[PDB]
Tab-separated table of C-alpha atoms and ligand atoms in Angstrom:
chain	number	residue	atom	x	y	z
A	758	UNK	CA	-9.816	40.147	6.717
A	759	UNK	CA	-13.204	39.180	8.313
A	760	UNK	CA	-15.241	36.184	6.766
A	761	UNK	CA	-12.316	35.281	4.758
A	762	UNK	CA	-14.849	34.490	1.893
A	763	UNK	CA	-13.270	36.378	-1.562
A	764	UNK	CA	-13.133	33.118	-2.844
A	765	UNK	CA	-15.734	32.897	-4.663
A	766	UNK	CA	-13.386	31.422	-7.322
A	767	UNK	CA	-15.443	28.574	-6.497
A	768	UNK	CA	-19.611	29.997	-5.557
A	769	UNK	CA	-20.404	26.928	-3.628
A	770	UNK	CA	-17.370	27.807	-0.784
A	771	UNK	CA	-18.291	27.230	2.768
A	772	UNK	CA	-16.053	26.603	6.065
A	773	UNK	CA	-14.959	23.238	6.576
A	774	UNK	CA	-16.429	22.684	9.618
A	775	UNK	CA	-20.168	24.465	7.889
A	776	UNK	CA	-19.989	21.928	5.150
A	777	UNK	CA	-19.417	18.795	7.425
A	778	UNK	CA	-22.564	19.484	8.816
A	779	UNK	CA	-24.338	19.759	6.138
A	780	UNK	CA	-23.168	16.518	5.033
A	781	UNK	CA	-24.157	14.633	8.347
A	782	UNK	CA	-26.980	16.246	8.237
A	783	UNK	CA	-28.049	15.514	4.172
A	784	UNK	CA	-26.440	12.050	5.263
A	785	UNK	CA	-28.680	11.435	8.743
A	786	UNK	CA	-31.634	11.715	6.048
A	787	UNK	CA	-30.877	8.903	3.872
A	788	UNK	CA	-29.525	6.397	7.033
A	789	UNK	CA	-26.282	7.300	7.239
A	790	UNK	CA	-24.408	7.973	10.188
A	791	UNK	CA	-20.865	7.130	12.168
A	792	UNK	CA	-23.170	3.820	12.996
A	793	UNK	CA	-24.067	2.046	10.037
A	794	UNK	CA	-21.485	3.387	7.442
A	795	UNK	CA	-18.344	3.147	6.343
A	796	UNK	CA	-15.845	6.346	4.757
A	797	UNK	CA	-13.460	5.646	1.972
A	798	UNK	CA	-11.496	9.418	1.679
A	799	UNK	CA	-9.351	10.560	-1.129
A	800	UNK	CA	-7.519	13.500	-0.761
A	801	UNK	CA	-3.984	14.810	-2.187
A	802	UNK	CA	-1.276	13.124	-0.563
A	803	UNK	CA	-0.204	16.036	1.281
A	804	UNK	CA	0.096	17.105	4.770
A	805	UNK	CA	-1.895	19.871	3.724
A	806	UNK	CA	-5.329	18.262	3.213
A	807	UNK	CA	-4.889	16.073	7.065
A	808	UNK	CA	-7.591	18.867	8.332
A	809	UNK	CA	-10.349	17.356	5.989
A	810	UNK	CA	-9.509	13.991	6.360
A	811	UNK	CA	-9.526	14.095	10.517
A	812	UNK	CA	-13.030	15.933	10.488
A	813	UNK	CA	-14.503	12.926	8.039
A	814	UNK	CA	-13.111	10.267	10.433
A	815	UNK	CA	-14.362	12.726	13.199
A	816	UNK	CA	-17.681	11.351	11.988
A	817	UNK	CA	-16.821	8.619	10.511
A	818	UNK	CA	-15.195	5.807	13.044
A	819	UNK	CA	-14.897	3.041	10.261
A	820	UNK	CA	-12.783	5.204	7.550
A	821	UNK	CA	-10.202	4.143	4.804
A	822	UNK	CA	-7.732	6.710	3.253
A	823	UNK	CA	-6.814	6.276	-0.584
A	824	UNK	CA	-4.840	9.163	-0.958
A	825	UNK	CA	-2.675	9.596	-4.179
A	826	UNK	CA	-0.984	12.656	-5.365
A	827	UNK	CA	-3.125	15.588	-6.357
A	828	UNK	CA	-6.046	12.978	-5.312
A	829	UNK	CA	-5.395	10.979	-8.401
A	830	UNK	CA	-7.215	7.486	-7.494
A	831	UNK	CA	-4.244	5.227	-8.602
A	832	UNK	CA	-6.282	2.262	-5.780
A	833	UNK	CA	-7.783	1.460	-8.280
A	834	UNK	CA	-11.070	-1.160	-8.240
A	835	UNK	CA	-8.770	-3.385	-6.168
A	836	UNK	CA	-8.024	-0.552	-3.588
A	837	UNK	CA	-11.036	0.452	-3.386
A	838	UNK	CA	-12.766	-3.186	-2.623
A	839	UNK	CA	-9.923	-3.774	-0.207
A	840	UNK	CA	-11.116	-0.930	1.935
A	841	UNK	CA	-14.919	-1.657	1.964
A	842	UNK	CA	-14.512	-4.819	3.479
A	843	UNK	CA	-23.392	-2.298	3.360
A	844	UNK	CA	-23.420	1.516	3.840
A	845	UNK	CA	-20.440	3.128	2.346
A	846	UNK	CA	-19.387	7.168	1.676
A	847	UNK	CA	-17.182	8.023	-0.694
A	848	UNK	CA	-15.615	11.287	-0.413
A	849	UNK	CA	-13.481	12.683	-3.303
A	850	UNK	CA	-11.115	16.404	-3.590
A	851	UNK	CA	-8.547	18.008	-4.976
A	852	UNK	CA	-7.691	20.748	-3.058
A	853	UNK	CA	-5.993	24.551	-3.585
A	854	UNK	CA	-4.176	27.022	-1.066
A	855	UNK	CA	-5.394	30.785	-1.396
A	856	UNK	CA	-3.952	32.979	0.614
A	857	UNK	CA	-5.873	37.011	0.368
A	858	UNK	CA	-5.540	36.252	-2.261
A	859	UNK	CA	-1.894	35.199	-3.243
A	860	UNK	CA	3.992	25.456	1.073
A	861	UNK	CA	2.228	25.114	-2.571
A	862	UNK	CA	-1.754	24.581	-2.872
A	863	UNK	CA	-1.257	21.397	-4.785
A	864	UNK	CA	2.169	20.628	-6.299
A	865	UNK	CA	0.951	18.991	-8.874
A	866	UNK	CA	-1.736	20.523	-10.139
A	867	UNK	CA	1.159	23.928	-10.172
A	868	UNK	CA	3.451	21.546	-12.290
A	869	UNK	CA	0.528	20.261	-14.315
A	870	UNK	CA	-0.987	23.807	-15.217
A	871	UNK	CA	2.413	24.769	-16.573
A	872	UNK	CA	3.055	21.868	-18.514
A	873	UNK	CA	-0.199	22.647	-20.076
A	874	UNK	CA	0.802	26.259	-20.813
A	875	UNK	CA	4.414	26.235	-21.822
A	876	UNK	CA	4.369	22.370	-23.632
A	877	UNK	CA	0.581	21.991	-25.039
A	878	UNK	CA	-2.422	20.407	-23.084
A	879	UNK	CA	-1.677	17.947	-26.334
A	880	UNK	CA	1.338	16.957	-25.145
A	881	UNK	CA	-0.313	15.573	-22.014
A	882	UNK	CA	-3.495	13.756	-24.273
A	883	UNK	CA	-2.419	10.179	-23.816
A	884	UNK	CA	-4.261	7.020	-24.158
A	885	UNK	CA	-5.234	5.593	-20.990
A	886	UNK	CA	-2.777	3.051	-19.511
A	887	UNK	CA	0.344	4.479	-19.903
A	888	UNK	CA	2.424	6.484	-17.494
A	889	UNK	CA	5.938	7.619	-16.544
A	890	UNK	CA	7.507	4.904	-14.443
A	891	UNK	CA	9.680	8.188	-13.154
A	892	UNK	CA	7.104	9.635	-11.935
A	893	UNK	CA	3.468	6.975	-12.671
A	894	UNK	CA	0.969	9.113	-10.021
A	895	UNK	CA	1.824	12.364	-11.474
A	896	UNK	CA	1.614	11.498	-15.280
A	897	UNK	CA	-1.553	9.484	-14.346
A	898	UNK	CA	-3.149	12.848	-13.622
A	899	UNK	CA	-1.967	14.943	-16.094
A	900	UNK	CA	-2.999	12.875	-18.880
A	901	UNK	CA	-6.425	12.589	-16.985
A	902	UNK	CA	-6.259	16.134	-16.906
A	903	UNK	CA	-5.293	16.334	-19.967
A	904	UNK	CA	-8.016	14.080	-21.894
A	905	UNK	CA	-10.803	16.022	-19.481
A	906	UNK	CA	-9.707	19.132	-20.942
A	907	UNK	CA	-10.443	18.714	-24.311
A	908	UNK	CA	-13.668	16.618	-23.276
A	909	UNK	CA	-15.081	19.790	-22.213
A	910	UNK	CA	-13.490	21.918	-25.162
A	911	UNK	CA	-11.410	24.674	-22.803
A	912	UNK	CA	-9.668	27.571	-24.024
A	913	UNK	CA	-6.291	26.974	-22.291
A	914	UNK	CA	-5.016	30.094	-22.712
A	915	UNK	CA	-8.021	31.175	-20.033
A	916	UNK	CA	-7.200	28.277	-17.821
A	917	UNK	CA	-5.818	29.807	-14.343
A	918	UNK	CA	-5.612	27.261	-11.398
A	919	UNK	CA	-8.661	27.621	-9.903
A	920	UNK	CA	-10.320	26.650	-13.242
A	921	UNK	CA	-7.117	23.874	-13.735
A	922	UNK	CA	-8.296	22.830	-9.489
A	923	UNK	CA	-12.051	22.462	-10.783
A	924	UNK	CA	-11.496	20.373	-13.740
A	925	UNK	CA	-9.335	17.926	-11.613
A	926	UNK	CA	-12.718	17.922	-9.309
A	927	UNK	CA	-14.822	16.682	-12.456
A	928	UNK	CA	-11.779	14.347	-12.737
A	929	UNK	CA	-11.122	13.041	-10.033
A	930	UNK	CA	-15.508	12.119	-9.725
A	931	UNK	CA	-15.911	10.845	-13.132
A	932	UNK	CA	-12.746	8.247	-11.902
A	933	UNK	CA	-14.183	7.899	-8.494
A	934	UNK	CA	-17.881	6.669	-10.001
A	935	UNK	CA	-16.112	4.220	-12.935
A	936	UNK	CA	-14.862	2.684	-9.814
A	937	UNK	CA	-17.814	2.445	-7.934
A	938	UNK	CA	-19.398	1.105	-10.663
A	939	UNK	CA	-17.487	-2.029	-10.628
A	940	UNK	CA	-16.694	-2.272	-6.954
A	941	UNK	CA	-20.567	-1.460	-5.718
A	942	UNK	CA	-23.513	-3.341	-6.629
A	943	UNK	CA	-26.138	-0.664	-6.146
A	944	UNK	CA	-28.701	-3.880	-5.549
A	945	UNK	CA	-26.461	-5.643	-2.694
A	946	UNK	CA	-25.345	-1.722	-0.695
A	947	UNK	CA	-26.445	1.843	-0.559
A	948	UNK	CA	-23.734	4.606	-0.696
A	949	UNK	CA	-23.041	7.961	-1.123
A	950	UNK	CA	-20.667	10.279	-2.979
A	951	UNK	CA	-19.529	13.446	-1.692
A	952	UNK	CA	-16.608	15.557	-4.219
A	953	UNK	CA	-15.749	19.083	-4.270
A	954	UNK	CA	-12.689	21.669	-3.972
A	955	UNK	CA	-10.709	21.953	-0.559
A	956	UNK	CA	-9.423	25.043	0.331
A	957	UNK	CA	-6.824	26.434	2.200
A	958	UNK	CA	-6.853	29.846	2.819
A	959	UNK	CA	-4.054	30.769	5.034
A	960	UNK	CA	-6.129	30.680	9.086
A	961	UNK	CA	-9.455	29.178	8.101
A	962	UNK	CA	-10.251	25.823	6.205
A	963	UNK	CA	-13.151	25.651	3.549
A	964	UNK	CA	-14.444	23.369	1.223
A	965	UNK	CA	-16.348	24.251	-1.885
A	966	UNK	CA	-18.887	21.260	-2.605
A	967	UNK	CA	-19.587	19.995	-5.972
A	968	UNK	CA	-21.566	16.635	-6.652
A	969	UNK	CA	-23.435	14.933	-3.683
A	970	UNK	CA	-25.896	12.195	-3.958
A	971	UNK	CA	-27.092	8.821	-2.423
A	972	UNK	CA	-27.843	5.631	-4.004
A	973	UNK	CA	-30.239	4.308	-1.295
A	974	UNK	CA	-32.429	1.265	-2.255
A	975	UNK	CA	-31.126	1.491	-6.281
A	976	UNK	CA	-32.270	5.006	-6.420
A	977	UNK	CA	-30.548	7.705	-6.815
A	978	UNK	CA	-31.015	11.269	-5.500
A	979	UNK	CA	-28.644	14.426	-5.173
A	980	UNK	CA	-27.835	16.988	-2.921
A	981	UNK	CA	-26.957	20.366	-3.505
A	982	UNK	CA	-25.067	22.200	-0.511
A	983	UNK	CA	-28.020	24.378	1.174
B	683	UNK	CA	10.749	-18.566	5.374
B	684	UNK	CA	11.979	-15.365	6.450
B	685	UNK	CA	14.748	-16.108	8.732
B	686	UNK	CA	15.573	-12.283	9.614
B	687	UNK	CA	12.336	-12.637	11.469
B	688	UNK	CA	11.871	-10.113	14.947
B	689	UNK	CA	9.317	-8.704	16.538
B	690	UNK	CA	8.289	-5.508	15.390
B	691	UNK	CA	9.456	-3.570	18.686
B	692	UNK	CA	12.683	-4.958	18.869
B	693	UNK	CA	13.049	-3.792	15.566
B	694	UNK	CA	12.345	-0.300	16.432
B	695	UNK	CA	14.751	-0.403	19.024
B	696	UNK	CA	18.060	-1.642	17.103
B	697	UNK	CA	16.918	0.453	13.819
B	698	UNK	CA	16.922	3.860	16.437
B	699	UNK	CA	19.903	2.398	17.843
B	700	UNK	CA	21.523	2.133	14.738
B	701	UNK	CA	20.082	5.387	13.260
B	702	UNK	CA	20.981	7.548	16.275
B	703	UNK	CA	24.777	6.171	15.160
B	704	UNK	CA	24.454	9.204	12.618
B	705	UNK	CA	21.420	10.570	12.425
B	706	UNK	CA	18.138	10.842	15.000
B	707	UNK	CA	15.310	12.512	15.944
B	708	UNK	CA	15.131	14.596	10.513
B	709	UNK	CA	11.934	13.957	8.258
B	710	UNK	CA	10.565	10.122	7.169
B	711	UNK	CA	9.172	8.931	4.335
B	712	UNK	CA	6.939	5.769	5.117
B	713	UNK	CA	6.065	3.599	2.732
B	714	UNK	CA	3.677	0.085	2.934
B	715	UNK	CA	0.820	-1.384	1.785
B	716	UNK	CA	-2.798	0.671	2.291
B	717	UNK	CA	-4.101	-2.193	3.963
B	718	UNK	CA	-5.178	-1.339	7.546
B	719	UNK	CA	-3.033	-3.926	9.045
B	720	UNK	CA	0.687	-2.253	8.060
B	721	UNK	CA	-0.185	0.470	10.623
B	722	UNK	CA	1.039	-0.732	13.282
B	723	UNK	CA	5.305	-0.194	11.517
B	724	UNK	CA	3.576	3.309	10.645
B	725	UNK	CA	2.805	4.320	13.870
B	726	UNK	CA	6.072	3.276	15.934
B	727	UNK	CA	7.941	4.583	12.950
B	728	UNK	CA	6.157	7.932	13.518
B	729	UNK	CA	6.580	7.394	17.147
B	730	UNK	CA	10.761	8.044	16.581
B	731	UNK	CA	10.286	10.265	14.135
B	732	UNK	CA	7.162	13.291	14.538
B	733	UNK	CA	8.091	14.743	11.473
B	734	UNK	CA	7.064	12.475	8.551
B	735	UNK	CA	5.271	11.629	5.696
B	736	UNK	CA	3.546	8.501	3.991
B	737	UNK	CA	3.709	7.098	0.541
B	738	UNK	CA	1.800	4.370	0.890
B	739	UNK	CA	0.233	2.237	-2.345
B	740	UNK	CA	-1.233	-1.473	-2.951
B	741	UNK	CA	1.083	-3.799	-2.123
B	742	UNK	CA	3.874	-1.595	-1.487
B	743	UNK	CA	4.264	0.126	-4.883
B	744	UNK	CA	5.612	2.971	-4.747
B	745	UNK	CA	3.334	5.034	-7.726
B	746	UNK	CA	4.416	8.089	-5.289
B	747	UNK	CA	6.917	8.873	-7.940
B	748	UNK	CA	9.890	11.721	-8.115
B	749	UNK	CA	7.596	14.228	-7.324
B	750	UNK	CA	5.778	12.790	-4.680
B	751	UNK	CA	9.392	11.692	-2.867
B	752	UNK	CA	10.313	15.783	-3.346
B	753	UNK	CA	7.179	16.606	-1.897
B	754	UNK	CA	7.802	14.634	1.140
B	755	UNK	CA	11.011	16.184	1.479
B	756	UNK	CA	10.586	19.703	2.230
B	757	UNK	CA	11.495	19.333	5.548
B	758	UNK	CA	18.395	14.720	7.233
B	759	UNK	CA	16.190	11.837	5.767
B	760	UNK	CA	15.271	8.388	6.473
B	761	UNK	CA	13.509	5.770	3.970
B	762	UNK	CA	11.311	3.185	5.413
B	763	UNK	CA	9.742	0.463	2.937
B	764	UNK	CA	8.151	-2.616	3.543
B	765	UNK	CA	5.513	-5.037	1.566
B	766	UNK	CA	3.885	-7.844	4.072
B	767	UNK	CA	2.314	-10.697	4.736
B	768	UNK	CA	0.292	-12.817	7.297
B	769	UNK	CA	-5.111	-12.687	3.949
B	770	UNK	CA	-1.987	-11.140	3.441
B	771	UNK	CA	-1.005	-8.755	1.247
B	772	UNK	CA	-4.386	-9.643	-0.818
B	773	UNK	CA	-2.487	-7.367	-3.608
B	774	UNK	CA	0.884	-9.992	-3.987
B	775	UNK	CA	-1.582	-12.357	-3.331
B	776	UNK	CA	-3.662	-11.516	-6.583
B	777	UNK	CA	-0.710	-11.030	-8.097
B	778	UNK	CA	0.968	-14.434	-7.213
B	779	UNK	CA	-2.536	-15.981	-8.058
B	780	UNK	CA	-1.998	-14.596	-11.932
B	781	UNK	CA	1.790	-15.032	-12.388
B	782	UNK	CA	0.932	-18.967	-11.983
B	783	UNK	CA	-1.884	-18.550	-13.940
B	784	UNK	CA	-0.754	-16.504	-16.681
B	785	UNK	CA	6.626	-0.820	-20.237
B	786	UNK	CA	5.057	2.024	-18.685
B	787	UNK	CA	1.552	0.486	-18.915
B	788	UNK	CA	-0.842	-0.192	-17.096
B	789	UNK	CA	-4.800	-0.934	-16.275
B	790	UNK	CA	-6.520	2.302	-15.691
B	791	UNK	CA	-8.795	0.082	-13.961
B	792	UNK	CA	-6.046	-0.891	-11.200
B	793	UNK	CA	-2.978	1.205	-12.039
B	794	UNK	CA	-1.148	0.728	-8.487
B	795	UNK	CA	-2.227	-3.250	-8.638
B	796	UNK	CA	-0.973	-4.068	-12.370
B	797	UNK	CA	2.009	-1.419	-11.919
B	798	UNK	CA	3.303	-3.524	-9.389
B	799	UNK	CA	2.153	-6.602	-11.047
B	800	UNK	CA	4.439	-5.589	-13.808
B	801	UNK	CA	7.400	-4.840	-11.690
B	802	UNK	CA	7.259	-7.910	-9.874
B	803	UNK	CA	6.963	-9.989	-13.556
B	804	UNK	CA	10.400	-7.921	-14.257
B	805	UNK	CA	12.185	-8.888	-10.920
B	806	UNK	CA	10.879	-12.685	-11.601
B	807	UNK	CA	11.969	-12.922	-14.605
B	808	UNK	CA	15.257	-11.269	-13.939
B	809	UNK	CA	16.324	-13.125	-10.822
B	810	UNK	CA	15.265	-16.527	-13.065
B	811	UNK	CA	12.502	-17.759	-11.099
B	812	UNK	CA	10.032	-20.320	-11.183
B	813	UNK	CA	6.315	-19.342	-11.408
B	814	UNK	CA	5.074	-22.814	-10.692
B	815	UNK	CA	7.237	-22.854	-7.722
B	816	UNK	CA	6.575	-19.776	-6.494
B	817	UNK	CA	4.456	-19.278	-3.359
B	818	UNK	CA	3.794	-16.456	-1.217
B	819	UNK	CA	6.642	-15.873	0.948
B	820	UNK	CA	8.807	-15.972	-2.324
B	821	UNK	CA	6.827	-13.211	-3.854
B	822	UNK	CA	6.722	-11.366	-0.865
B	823	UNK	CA	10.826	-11.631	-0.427
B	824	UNK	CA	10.710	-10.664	-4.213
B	825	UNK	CA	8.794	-7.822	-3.712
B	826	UNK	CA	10.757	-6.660	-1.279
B	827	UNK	CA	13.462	-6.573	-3.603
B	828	UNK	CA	11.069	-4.533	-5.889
B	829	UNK	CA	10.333	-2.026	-3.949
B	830	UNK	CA	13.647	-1.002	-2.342
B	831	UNK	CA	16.122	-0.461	-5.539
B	832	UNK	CA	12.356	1.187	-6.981
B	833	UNK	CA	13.087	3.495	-3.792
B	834	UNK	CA	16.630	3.803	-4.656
B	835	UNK	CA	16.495	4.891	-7.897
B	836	UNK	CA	13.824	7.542	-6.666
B	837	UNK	CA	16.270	8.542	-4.096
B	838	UNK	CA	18.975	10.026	-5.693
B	839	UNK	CA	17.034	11.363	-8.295
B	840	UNK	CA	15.474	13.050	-5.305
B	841	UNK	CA	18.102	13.395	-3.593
B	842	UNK	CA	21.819	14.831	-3.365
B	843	UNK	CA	24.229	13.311	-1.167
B	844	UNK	CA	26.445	15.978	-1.114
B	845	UNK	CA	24.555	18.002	0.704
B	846	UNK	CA	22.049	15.774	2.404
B	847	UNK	CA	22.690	12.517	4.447
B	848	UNK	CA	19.768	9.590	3.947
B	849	UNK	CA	18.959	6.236	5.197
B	850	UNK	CA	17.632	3.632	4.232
B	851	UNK	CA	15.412	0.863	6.309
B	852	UNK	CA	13.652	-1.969	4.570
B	853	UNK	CA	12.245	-5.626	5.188
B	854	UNK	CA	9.083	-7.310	5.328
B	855	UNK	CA	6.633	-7.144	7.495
B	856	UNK	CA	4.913	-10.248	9.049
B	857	UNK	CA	2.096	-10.655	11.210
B	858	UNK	CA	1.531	-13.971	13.037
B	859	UNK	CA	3.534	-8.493	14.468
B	860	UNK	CA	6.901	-9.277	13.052
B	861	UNK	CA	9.399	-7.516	10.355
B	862	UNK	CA	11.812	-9.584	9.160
B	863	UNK	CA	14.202	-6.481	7.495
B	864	UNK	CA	16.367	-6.903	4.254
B	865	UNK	CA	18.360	-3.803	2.755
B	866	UNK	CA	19.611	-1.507	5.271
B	867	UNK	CA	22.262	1.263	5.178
B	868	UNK	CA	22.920	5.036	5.912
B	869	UNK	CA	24.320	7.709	3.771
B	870	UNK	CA	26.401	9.929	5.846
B	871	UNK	CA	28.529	13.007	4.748
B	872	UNK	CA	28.913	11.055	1.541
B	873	UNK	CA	29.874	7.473	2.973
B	874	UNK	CA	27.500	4.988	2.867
B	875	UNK	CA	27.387	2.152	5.507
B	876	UNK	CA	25.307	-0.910	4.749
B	877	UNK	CA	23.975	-2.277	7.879
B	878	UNK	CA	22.736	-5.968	9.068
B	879	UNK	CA	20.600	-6.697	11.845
B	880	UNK	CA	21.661	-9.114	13.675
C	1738	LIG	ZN1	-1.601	18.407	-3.471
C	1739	LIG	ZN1	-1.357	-5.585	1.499
């Protein structure tokens, strides 16, 4: 009941408020600041995640929000281009409630988990494209999920959400850079990427970073959190 | 083209009005387009109601799904939706530009984009429409008409009128800021009472 810090379900944890710093700071380095730069976020669609969002934009004066649920990116390359218009910061989570340790962390991400453990994960393994018109956001993730969780080759049966949380993290990125690929030429802007776990523990907000790098000049070069 | 036509703060004052008839304050879903410009609706809409939450997707589209609506909901309720216009809606726009040019799918690429590129082929096609003849305002109107039985059937899905009351508030949204509304009713106690401004 003092640091708060047991969740080292995710080793790279730090306060919210710690890691924005670090960020500015690793940012400040390669030319970026509230000045020159603009923010794209893209967070769950919950209420939840507003405390991340509001200390980006804190920094960040020009800021656009492509929130979808569980942080799928359903923008798309359209959405995204929409919002960047020579300096632009991505920043990409899912995000997880923990309380010390255990009005739900993400919604979908507790739906998606047990679809993956009662139905299969193959169940979910679609081919790109498709979706329930019910519910499109939602099945857009799973199968995204899904497909990323047999890319890897994971036991399922030893999936728990915190593992579940941190593959959508290596989801939602991979989605984030096929995206910047074709909305950023790398010649015409520098950017950077910022991705990682958000975490409510329930009352202190922390963020567990995961990849971080600039492309400044075409070059690329990452950053770890210390 | 859009002869409902008001300014936006009118608007907010005879959709209270009328709202306050049943229900005031009760949570609200907000949906419009991501672009920057449809935050000026979000904002007065938030300004009547504190308790709220937003939906928004390109052009409109409401890829929020079931779940999302449910999500929303957890604390009766009151559904705002609204594509626009002025660049415009550069999404109807891109989509207008291909319909005159050119199931559960879409591009992975742009899923919100083609989803509602898709829906809006569907309403076209439906209401018998001519692609060649269509322009922006049409599309716009269309979409409009997209969007709001979309809402409705993730209503009551969402939703059960026997033990909640809902509204429902929707229109377009025009800039030179403006909202010419469309489909408006409230479901009280089990009666529903469309609703026509002026
Ligand atoms: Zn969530
Ligand atoms: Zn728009």
């Amino acid at each position: 009941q003092r640091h708060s810090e047991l969740i080292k379900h995710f080793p790279s944890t730090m306060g919210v408020d710690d890691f924005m710093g670090r960020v500015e700071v690793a940012l400040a380095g390669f030319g970026f600041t509230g000045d020159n730069t603009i923010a794209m976020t893209n967070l769950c669609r919950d209420e939840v995640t507003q405390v991340l969002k509001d200390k980006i934009e804190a920094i960040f004066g020009s800021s656009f929000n492509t929130n979808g649920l569980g942080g799928v990116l359903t923008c798309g390359v359209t959405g995204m281009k929409a919002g960047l218009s020579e300096r632009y910061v991505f920043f990409a989570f899912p995000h997880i409630a923990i309380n010390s340790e255990g009005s739900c962390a993400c919604g979908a991400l507790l739906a998606i988990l047990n679809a993956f453990k009662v139905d299969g994960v193959e169940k979910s393994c679609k081919v790109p494209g498709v979706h329930d018109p019910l519910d499109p956001e939602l099945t857009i993730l799973q199968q995204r999920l899904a497909r990323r969780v047999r890319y890897e080759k994971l036991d399922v049966s030893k999936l728990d959400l915190p593992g579940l949380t941190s593959v959508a993290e290596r989801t939602i990125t991979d989605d984030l850079e096929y995206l910047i690929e074709k909305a950023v030429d790398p010649a015409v802007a520098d950017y950077a990427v910022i991705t990682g776990v958000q975490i409510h523990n329930w009352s202190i907000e922390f963020v567990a970073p995961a990849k971080c790098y600039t492309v400044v000049n075409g070059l690329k070069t990452y950053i770890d959190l210390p």
